[PDB]
Design a protein around this ligand. Structure first.
Ligand SMILES: *[C@@H]1O[C@H](CO)[C@@H](O[C@@H]2O[C@H](CO)[C@@H](O[C@@H]3O[C@H](CO)[C@@H](O)[C@H](O[C@@H]4O[C@H](CO)[C@@H](O)[C@H](O)[C@@H]4O)[C@@H]3O)[C@H](O)[C@H]2NC(C)=O)[C@H](O)[C@H]1NC(C)=O
Ligand SMILES: *[C@@H]1O[C@H](CO)[C@@H](O[C@@H]2O[C@H](CO)[C@@H](O[C@@H]3O[C@H](CO)[C@@H](O)[C@H](O)[C@@H]3O)[C@H](O)[C@H]2NC(C)=O)[C@H](O)[C@H]1NC(C)=O
Ligand SMILES: *[C@@H]1O[C@H](CO)[C@@H](O[C@@H]2O[C@H](CO)[C@@H](O[C@@H]3O[C@H](CO)[C@@H](O)[C@H](O)[C@@H]3O)[C@H](O)[C@H]2NC(C)=O)[C@H](O)[C@H]1NC(C)=O
Ligand SMILES: Nc1ncnc2c1ncn2[C@@H]1O[C@H](COP(=O)(O)OP(=O)(O)OP(O)(O)=S)[C@@H](O)[C@H]1O
Ligand SMILES: Nc1ncnc2c1ncn2[C@@H]1O[C@H](COP(=O)(O)OP(=O)(O)OP(O)(O)=S)[C@@H](O)[C@H]1O
Ligand SMILES: *[C@@H]1O[C@H](CO)[C@@H](O)[C@H](O)[C@H]1NC(C)=O
Ligand SMILES: *[C@@H]1O[C@H](CO)[C@@H](O)[C@H](O)[C@H]1NC(C)=O
Ligand SMILES: *[C@@H]1O[C@H](CO)[C@@H](O)[C@H](O)[C@H]1NC(C)=O
Length: 1808
């Protein structure tokens, strides 16, 4: 058991040792992909980012100075790792050290002190703020722009000049980019009803209040000169500085739109005016005050409540500035704060929130009827520290793909090797020698699995070294890769168990290896949709399981601890498989694959997809015995093998004799261990083979018919393997090897150590191998099945050298080989034992005896009396004239009695007029036919015009016969797209911008804040209560108090930690969380169970959670608690639903001075004094100053926290806050439900310049239809090339070439035909498009472009694939391959270009236009993308002007021109490819050389052919002279060179040396003239299957030139000459064997060629048809036309052909007429002697002495034949008595004489 496994492993390794290239490829190819992956990883390393806090952004409702401070200071949005002052619950303003704030505070306290007084100089002098202001005023420029000075202070042609000055600094250029649209904008409102007029007046009041500096200016200019004239460092500097500041402020006010507010009557006019302003770049925003009572709201409810009181608003702006409003959350989650002002924070610089706040404030002021106050601020939540790395998701989604791409190659090699050893049956013989399937399959396991576990280790090493998977231990990953390798090996064997062909299985198994990877890709995208349980079901496929384990590997890799011994059995997340449980599924799937193979091998088993007896030897010992053995196949009800009672004896070479199909191979195989005997017994050597099992194998050796040799194994290795397996010991295998080696004499050939280098001789080695075990019994099967006659001598000699002591049973089909070797013969026919006996005993048991024929140049009774005188018995069977056959009596035949007859005949020969007597022995050929037949009975330009017409006719008749094939290949693709048009009538979603109802409820269930700070005010209570009302909570405020505690319990384990620390809520309460430790990386931050430890009170309303976080550290709480909400949804990482989005905090501390009443009192006192103006401008200014002083208090404020990862979070909560304020200021009752505000978002239409880019988004569904059109139209040309491939595979194409047809005209006819075929689908497609009214297609300008595209695409694509006919030798496979190639090129190119154009965010990828201009050199890409450009061009024109043409040569014109250029060159290429190629014997040999005979039709002259690599000519130095009026004959054994001679003479194959002339026409000089008068009929039956034979005949006649009227009669005569009457109307495909041959012969005969060539005309043909062939050829030769014919039927040549030539090794031997040959050498008699002594000297000595001629013919130990001088003058009677005496003189049992037999001519054939 172990030795068999060792031998199998040694063989499997010996295969691989020989090839040093496939091993290198399989070792290096998998590593290249991972080196590429290592390079990619080295390209993009991860980046680490720390914590950062964001500053505060104030809204205009809070104020104007802080709002400007936020506009300029907070542009950069720089992170601050430390806490910012704005986040503290008390502080609401960040800038405390700002110069402006210091100036304001100092001024307020100075006026307060002055009002208290009425010392002032002392208070004012000690002020740093005044000194700083003076220094800032005294600045000699030094700044790029005034914005720099403004920043330093805080933290019209003149206007254009100021902008140009600002252009100097790019950083300030961004500031002006943010400022210019709002400064110079044109606000608009489509409704102009008086209510909207009131609203816009309220809004305009803000800008009117902003326009109050000019009044202070003019009071300055009218009070300046008064003081200047009154009084005339302090004075001179002060006056100049005040004047300069006033002038600068006035210059700033010069660039003011002032009345930016404008109105429009309608929405359409609104859009038009906005577009015009955008063209002028003067547009900022547009507003629409749509009324709910109008109810004209697209895709939204008309109104929530009936009647007025509800305000619905739409703010439309430029698309480039407002965020796209199609989707809510990003499609790929990112590990970042999502806070970059340029890319994601668009509303801050866009201005949407500013205008929303202004409009909401105006609306609440109008509706409520009161004056609310609420300073709104915007604050960004802080974010933990993280690491940005895109590479880990790349591994999560891409690692399985690279592994499968690396391991496809080994699966291909394994499947090809298994199917190779399966197809050639080299494995099937190993079962007979004893080896069982288990050993072979275990050898396959342990041998194929080798390279997999040598590549897995290298991959693991590369993974660890290349930093792709660091911080992990290689053992755990190896224990997974090895499981995958086992699973894929079993899968490869399962695939190998499907097919029975080598190349097909090798190419197809690699397809099913990849096709099972698709479900993983299809299910990873639908991660949430699939249930948990179905994942295990989908994990049955091995790559799916590998991917599902690889996601867990990557997920554990993120957390800093890769696959390691600590966490092998731990699930990283609730619904991801642990790395351990994946291996179990992989091994279970491998076992399932093994069981599937085990079952599948059982579906088709077994199939390799008269009582006259003599039993009496001198020693009776039945070493082998078969008794009543019978076997029945289920397919045939009659048994395959019937009763076989034949016995065997040791030492006798018993031979089976029977025709093919008699059950000989089955009977031989039953005795061996390959099939079960159905019944009876098969006792061998005394113990049955089934029972004896391996005990009988060492004494039995079997060699079957098919050759059993392993190609790569050397000469000696075969004997080594085949001796070791039988159980032979190690020391003597050397000797048995040497014995068989010299017995065949291959010692020197053992040095080269090759097995596939030597050919033909291998059968000798295969026969010898059967004797390696010294077996007592040997069962050979056809030892001479397919070897040449030159080598059968060695097989005969060895099989007779091993004849003594070893029973040998062989099976031969030839009748000759049943007498030379067989000691007994058993006749089998139809699976039954017809006859048995011995060769000598069989011959004697006939009714007739010994034949003596008497020819005539007197009277039978005189001869009868003379014969009766010498021998009494005389049977007279034949008495016809000219021959007198006498039957000598075998019963009582005597050597002397027959002798005396010839003695008297010679003396009386003259007067008897016999002139020769013929003695004939009873031949064994006819008795075999006699008994079997008896046994069977017992059981029972003018030429061109006719030339083009025929080619079209042949193709036309092809379509008529096959209409189902034409319909599917042509009509079905056209109807494929047609049904799609109706099914694709759904609305196309492409990216259009709908209107989104911006509200907080759209996001969904969430957690919200209602923290309160400084609640000591009755007014704040109303707002706090109102905030809860909108959230859906219980209306009464005391409900929370009624609920009392509404919080979860504190965890017990955290209580000890809290007690350990101080846990003051304000100061840092909890402990720090985990972070990046330097050597490790973490994506999130993992805290303890104590982050803001006590669960804050939570109340649930209507799908919402509200949390009371008052007096608690908010920043630390948010930072600590953030990752816990996210980690629930990090499993899929596609659409992450955060839980907290936004929250409110009611600030109560005011930044400015709380007491502004004293400032107002001081202002009023100043107004009363100082002579107030009667006009009242100064009084107006001071009244507004007092109003500002009252507004300085800012009694209540509010702050809003928002999460930036939610795009529309800001606006929704601003809307919620404004609605809450409106509810709060409205008194309680039903009025609260009546009043509400709704806000929306809808971007404007695309501008023309923006249309030029957005048209790309407009393509939409067009891509889907274009792909279907390309797919449908990519079918037909493969069907076009199908028929051409079929014609080229058969020789019928060469028949057409040999005819009058020229290949170029044939190609042209094919081109016209298949264009005529292709034209119909184009029209069908056009009418289908026109029927359903596609706007892009039905346009009068577009239609000609589409028609030209379709017609030209058909016209040029066809010549691409005609050259592919030569490459592919099979029709069906080429069809699929070329269709897939067309689909590949077209779809891939079109999709790649279309995607590249869409996503041209970076202009570097836009340069692909030159790549497309390269792609115009390819013809199939032109059709695909060309249709895409057609639809868009009309789409733009439908909106560019209504709200140029495809015929012009830029959209599809380039494609058309280039592809028409491509058209003819491929036809030229294939046409060039078609023409790419550029003593009797001695007397006749000299005659041709000396002179040429004009009568000779065919004259060969020194013809020679040399195949490459053979080094010996197939035909060498061949020359012949053939007279015209006779019929020739050529003879030779298979392999002599007949077919090569016919091909060079005919012209199919090039001639290496020499030329032939036909009818005075040289082949090289003018082949076409020679082609006219020749008719060729090879062995191959070159006909068109689909057409009927008659159509073939009319077609060839039309090529021949028969007049059209007589064509039918010519066809009738041509068919009637060779039957075919019943098969005339039947297609050539459905013909029997002989019918095709006779049809081909008739086709060669039709047209009456001058010379007709026939290669093997008769091969298994009925005698009647061959007789018709005789008659036809006799008539032809009567007419005077030469017929060259070659066949192996020797009786045919003698009867008809005038001359016969026999050829060996390409050289003639006789070259004479049959009658000359029959007399020159084939005359005389040959004595046949049987000698058991095996001594040549005793037999040769007496024959040579008695007869002068001592030539030896057919010398063998079994039987010896002799040659003696022919035509002996002495009587033949001399030998008979001489034989009688010399049988005693020298050892000879019996003899026979061969004198002028019918077989004498046959014996002549064999020897020469
Ligand atoms: C609400 O919770 C907040 C959580 O951040 C907390 O913020 C802390 O604010 C204080 C300053 O008021 C800072 O405390 C730091 O504590 C660490 C302890 O590890 C000290 O090392 C650190 O000293 C410096 O820290 C720098 C950056 O960490 C470092 O580069 C220097 O070399 C030096 O070591 C500070 O003293 C810190 O900003 C915040 N961290 C904490 C948790 O202390 C708030 O105090 C809390 N609410 C309030 C307003 O009290
Ligand atoms: C949100 O949480 C705050 C936590 O301060 C709640 O305010 C507190 O509510 C309780 C009644 O449930 C009151 O406590 C009172 O404290 C004073 C001493 O300051 C004591 O003399 C009283 O007998 C009473 O215990 C008070 O309203 C307030 N306590 C404070 C200032 O801490 C608030 O009620 C929660 N939200 C809602 C709407 O329930
Ligand atoms: C800006 O783009 C909008 C996109 O909706 C254009 O509105 C659409 O314009 C078409 C005319 O081109 C109109 O279609 C009408 O639709 C109603 C049903 O809503 C139908 O009953 C009418 O018979 C007509 O087909 C309509 O104004 C509107 N169509 C819609 C809402 O689907 C708008 O014209 C563009 N404006 C400019 C000047 O760019
Ligand atoms: N695969 C098969 N193997 C053996 N016998 C078969 C097979 N298929 C059919 N038969 C039966 O075998 C009989 C026909 O003769 P076979 O036994 O096939 O001849 P054979 O032994 O192949 O002939 P030769 O001349 O020895 S190669 C009929 O009973 C068939 O139904
Ligand atoms: N596949 C092959 N086709 C043609 N010739 C071959 C082939 N293989 C070897 N030969 C050479 O051709 C000669 C043997 O075949 P030929 O005698 O030319 O033809 P043939 O065997 O009589 O042809 P048939 O009757 O069609 S099998 C020797 O020179 C061979 O070496
Ligand atoms: C500075 O201190 C606190 C910080 O918020 C602030 O309330 C106060 O008004 C500031 N002082 C001034 C007026 O600059
Ligand atoms: C809006 O304000 C401007 C001043 O900026 C004023 O000229 C104009 O008349 C106002 N329009 C309305 C509708 O009040
Ligand atoms: C502010 O000025 C406006 C004029 O623009 C005046 O109508 C209004 O009464 C003033 N408001 C107060 C209260 O100062």
């Amino acid at each position: 058991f172990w030795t068999q496994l060792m031998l199998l492993l040694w063989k499997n390794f010996m295969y691989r040792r020989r090839q040093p290239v496939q091993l290198l490829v399989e070792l290096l190819w998998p590593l290249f992909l991972f080196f590429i992956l290592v390079a990619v990883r080295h390209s993009h390393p991860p980046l680490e980012h720390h914590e950062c806090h964001f500053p505060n952004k104030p809204l205009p409702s809070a104020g104007t100075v802080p709002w400007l401070q936020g506009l300029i200071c907070n542009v950069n949005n720089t992170c601050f790792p430390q806490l910012t002052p704005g986040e503290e619950p008390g502080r609401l303003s960040n800038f405390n050290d700002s110069l402006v704030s210091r100036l304001l505070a100092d001024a307020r306290t100075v006026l307060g002190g002055a009002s208290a007084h009425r010392d002032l100089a002392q208070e004012l002098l000690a002020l740093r703020s005044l000194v700083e202001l003076r220094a800032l005023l005294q600045r000699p420029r030094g700044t790029s722009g005034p914005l720099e000075l403004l920043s330093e202070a805080l933290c019209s042609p003149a206007c254009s000049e100021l902008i140009g000055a600002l252009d100097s600094h790019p950083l300030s250029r961004l500031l002006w980019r943010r400022l210019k649209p709002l400064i110079l904008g044109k606000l608009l409102f489509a409704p102009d009803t008086p209510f909207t007029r009131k609203l816009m007046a309220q809004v305009n009041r803000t800008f009117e209040e902003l326009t109050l500096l000019r009044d202070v200016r003019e009071v300055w200019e009218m009070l300046g000169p008064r003081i200047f004239t009154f009084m005339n460092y302090s004075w001179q500097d002060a006056h100049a500085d005040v004047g300069h500041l006033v002038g600068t402020l006035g210059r700033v006010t010069e660039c003011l739109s002032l009345d930016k507010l404008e109105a429009a009557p309608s929405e359409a006019a609104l859009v038009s005016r906005a577009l015009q302003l955008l063209a002028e770049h003067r547009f900022w925003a547009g507003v629409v005050f749509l009324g709910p009572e109008d109810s004209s709201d697209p895709t939204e409810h008309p109104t929530p409540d009936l009647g007025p009181g509800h305000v619905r608003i739409k703010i439309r702006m430029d698309i480039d500035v407002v965020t796209r409003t199609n989707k809510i959350r990003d499609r790929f989650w990112d590990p970042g704060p999502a806070a970059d002002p340029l890319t994601d924070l668009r509303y801050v610089w866009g201005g949407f929130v500013y205008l929303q706040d202004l409009v909401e404030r105006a609306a609440v002021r109008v509706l409520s009827g009161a004056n609310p106050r609420a300073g709104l601020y915007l604050q960004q939540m802080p974010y933990p520290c993280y690491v940005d790395d895109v590479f880990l998701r790349v591994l999560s989604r891409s690692l399985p793909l690279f592994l499968t791409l690396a391991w496809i190659y080994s699966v291909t090699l394994t499947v090809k090797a298994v199917v190779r050893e399966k197809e050639t049956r080299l494995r099937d013989t190993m079962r007979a020698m004893g080896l069982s399937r288990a050993v072979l399959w275990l050898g396959w396991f342990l041998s194929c699995l080798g390279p997999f576990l040598l590549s897995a280790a290298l991959l693991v090493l590369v993974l660890k070294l290349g930093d792709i998977l660091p911080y992990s231990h290689p053992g755990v990953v190896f224990l997974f890769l090895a499981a995958f390798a086992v699973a894929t090996v079993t899968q490869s064997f399962l695939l190998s168990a499907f097919f029975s062909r080598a190349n097909l299985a090798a190419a197809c198994g690699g397809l099913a290896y990849f096709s099972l990877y698709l479900p993983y890709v299809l299910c990873v995208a639908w991660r949430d949709r699939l249930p948990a349980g179905g994942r295990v079901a989908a994990s049955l496929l091995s790559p799916v399981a590998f991917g599902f384990g690889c996601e867990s590997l990557a997920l554990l890799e993120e957390q800093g601890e890769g696959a390691q011994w600590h966490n092998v059995g731990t699930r990283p997340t609730a619904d991801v498989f642990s790395l351990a449980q994946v291996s179990g599924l992989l091994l279970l799937d491998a076992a399932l694959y093994g069981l599937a193979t085990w079952y599948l091998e059982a579906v088709c088993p077994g199939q390799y997809g008269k009582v006259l007896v003599e039993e009496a030897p001198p020693g009776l010992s039945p070493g082998v015995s078969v008794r009543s053995l019978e076997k029945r196949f289920p397919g045939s009800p009659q048994p395959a093998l019937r009763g076989l009672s034949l016995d065997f004896y040791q030492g006798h070479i018993t031979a089976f004799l029977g025709h093919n199909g008699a059950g000989k191979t089955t009977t031989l195989s039953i005795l061996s261990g390959l099939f079960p005997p159905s019944g009876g017994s098969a006792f061998i050597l005394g113990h049955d083979v089934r029972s004896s099992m391996a005990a009988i194998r060492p004494h039995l050796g079997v060699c079957p018919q098919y050759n059993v040799l392993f190609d790569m194994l050397t000469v000696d290795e075969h004997v080594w393997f085949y001796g070791r397996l039988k159980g032979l010991s190690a020391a003597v295998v050397g000797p048995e090897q040497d014995r068989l080696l010299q017995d065949v004499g291959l010692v020197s050939k053992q040095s080269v150590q090759t097995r596939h280098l030597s050919g033909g001789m291998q059968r000798k080695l295969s026969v010898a191998i059967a004797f390696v075990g010294g077996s007592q019994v040997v069962i050979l099967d056809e030892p001479t099945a397919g070897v040449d006659p030159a080598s059968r001598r060695g097989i005969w000699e060895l099989l007779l050298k091993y004849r003594e002591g070893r029973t040998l049973i062989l099976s031969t089909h030839h009748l000759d080989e049943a007498e030379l070797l067989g000691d007994r013969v058993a006749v089998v026919a139809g699976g039954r034992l017809c006859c048995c006996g011995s060769p000598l005993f069989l011959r004697r048991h006939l009714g007739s005896g010994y034949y003596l024929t008497l020819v005539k140049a007197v009277g039978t009774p005189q001869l009868l009396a003379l014969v009766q005188h010498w021998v009494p018995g005389a049977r007279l069977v034949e008495e016809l004239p000219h021959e007198l056959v006498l039957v000598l009596p075998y019963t009582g035949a005597h050597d002397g009695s027959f002798a005396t007859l010839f003695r008297e005949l010679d003396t009386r020969l003259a007067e008897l007029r016999l002139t020769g007597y013929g003695i004939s022995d009873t031949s064994l050929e006819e008795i075999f036919l006699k008994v079997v037949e008896e046994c069977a009975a017992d059981t029972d330009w003018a030429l061109t015009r006719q030339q083009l017409q025929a080619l079209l006719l042949k193709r036309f008749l092809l379509a008529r016969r096959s209409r189902r094939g034409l319909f599917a290949q042509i009509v079905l693709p056209a109807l494929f797209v047609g049904l799609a048009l109706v099914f694709s009538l759904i609305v196309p979603p492409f990216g259009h911008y709908p209107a989104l109802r911006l509200s907080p409820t759209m996001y969904g269930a969430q957690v919200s804040f209602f923290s309160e700070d400084a609640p000591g005010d009755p007014g704040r209570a109303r707002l706090l209560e109102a905030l809860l009302q909108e959230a859906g909570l219980e209306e009464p405020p005391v409900q929370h108090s009624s609920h009392r505690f509404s919080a979860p319990e504190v965890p017990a384990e955290v209580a000890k930690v809290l007690a350990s620390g101080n846990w003051t809520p304000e100061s840092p309460s909890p402990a720090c969380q985990c972070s990046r430790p330097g050597a490790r990386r973490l994506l999130p931050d993992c805290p303890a169970a104590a982050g803001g430890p006590p669960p804050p009170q939570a109340v649930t309303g209507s799908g919402e959670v509200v949390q009371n976080l008052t007096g608690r550290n908010l920043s630390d709480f948010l930072v600590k608690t953030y990752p816990r909400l996210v980690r629930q949804g990090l499993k899929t990482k596609k659409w992450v639903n955060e839980v907290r989005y936004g929250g409110f905090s009611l600030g109560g501390r005011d930044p400015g001075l709380p007491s502004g009443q004293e400032l107002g009192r001081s202002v009023e006192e100043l107004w009363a004094l100082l002579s107030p103006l009667p006009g009242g401008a100064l009084d107006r200014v001071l009244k507004n100053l007092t109003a500002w002083a009252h507004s300085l208090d800012a009694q209540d404020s509010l702050k809003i926290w928002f999460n930036n990862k939610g795009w529309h979070s800001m606006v929704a909560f601003v809307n919620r806050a404004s609605n809450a304020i409106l509810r709060a200021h409205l008194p309680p009752g039903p009025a609260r439900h009546a009043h509400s505000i709704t806000t929306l978002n809808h971007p404007l239409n695309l501008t023309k310049e923006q249309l030029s880019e957005g048209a790309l988004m407009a393509s939409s569904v067009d891509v889907l239809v274009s792909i279907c059109v390309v797919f449908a139209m990519s079918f037909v040309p493969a069907s076009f090339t199908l028929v051409l491939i079929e014609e080229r595979v058969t020789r019928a194409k060469h028949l057409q070439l040999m005819g009058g047809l020229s290949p170029t005209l044939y190609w042209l006819g094919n081109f016209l035909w298949d264009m005529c075929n292709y034209l119909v689908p184009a029209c069908i497609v056009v009418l289908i498009f026109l029927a359903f009214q596609q706007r892009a297609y039905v346009a009068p300008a577009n239609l000609p472009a589409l028609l030209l595209l379709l017609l030209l695409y058909g016209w040029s694509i066809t010549p691409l694939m005609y050259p592919a006919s030569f490459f592919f030798s099979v029709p069906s496979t080429a069809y699929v391959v070329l269709t897939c190639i067309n689909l590949f090129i077209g779809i891939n190119g079109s999709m790649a270009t279309f995607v590249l154009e869409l996503f041209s965010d970076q202009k570097l990828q836009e340069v692909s236009r030159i790549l497309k201009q390269v792609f115009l050199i390819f013809p199939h890409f032109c059709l695909g993308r060309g249709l895409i450009d057609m639809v868009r061009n009309q789409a733009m024109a439908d909106a560019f002007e209504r709200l140029q043409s495809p015929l012009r040569w830029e959209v599809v014109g380039k494609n058309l021109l280039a592809m028409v250029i491509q058209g003819p060159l491929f036809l030229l290429f294939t046409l060039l490819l078609q023409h790419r190629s550029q003593e009797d014997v001695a007397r006749e040999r000299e005659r041709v050389v000396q002179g040429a005979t004009q009568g000779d039709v065919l004259v060969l002259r020194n013809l020679t052919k040399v195949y490459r690599g053979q080094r010996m000519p197939a035909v060498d130095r061949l020359c012949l002279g053939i007279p015209p009026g006779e019929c020739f004959g050529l003879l030779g054994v298979n392999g002599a060179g007949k077919t090569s001679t016919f091909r060079m003479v005919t012209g199919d194959t090039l001639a290496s040396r020499g030329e032939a002339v036909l009818a005075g026409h040289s082949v090289a000089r003018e082949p076409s003239a020679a082609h006219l008068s020749m008719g060729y009929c090879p062995q191959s039956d070159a006909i068109f299957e689909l057409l009927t034979g008659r159509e073939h005949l009319e077609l060839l006649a039309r090529l021949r030139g028969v007049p059209e009227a007589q064509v039918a009669q010519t066809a009738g005569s041509g068919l009637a000459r060779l039957g075919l009457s019943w098969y005339a109307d039947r297609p050539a495909g459905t013909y029997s064997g002989g019918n095709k041959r006779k049809l081909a012969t008739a086709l060669a005969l039709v047209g009456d060629p001058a010379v007709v060539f026939l290669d093997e005309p008769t091969t298994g043909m009925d005698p009647s048809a061959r007789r018709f062939l005789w008659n036809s050829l006799l008539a032809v030769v009567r007419e005077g036309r030469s017929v060259m014919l070659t066949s192996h039927s020797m009786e045919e040549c003698e009867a008809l052909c005038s001359r016969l030539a026999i050829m060996v090794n390409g050289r003639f031997r006789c070259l004479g007429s049959p009658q000359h040959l029959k007399g020159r050498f084939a005359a005389g008699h040959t004595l046949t002697l049987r000698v058991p002594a095996a001594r040549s000297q005793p037999a040769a000595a007496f024959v040579a002495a008695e007869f002068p001629g001592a030539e030896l013919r057919e010398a063998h130990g079994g039987r010896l034949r002799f040659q003696l001088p022919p035509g002996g003058r002495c009587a033949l009677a001399r030998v008979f008595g001489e034989l009688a005496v010399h049988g005693a003189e020298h050892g000879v049992e019996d003899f026979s004489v061969s004198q002028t037999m019918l077989e004498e001519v046959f014996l002549y054939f064999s020897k020469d």
